[PDB]
Ligand binder design. Sequence first.
Ligand SMILES: NCCNC(=O)[C@H]1O[C@@H](n2cnc3c(N)ncnc32)[C@H](O)[C@@H]1O
Length: 221
Amino acid sequence: GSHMLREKSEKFAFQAEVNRMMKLIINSLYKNKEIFLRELISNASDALDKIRLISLTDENALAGNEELTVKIKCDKEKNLLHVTDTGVGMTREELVKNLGTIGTSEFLNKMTESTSELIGQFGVGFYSAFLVADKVIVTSKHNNDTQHIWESDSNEFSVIADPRGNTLGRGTTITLVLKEEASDYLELDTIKNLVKKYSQFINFPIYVWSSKTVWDWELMN
Ligand SMILES: NCCNC(=O)[C@H]1O[C@@H](n2cnc3c(N)ncnc32)[C@H](O)[C@@H]1O
């Protein structure tokens, strides 16, 4: 089963529109970077709504994970920020299509001609992660596929089957390899303050892995 790596069938290029959207997002929000977290939490909330809706009609929708939560983890020694939800998750096909492609023109023009509000409205808050990260990694497990990993440094992206297997049960983990100057988002206090402000209106429970020295999930909303 070497055909896949010898052919680079896991490597993809972004759609032109997306490259343009990413720059726009990064160019205008440079003064309001913290916004990225709200957008990831916002996306997490939407995925949780979806599985919840699916659970209404499909009895075995929550089989892979009964809880509906958003958990945030700061890994200082590894320079990573993790935002995990137990929502509907994404299939390999969706990882490629939903994150790699995309009133696109009206927005491309609207953005050019505070955009923190529009970005959310247009459903492209995902890319704001690149304001604070050199690499964004999406690990996701959907009910209809095996766990896969999507990764990108913004110049291309690849998707692979997670060799770790189904560790999520169901859901998605957004992993940010934070830029050297975005180290402050590794600080609990900072994260907690941001999460507490951007979670106040999320209907699902959001936690932050914090210390009191023992560690444990701490409810934020
Ligand atoms: N067009 C902007 C980029 N595309 C997305 O953000 C889409 O990817 C999917 N997505 C993003 N974050 C997600 C997440 N955390 N869980 C499940 N699906 C997610 C949704 O379809 C979302 O609209």
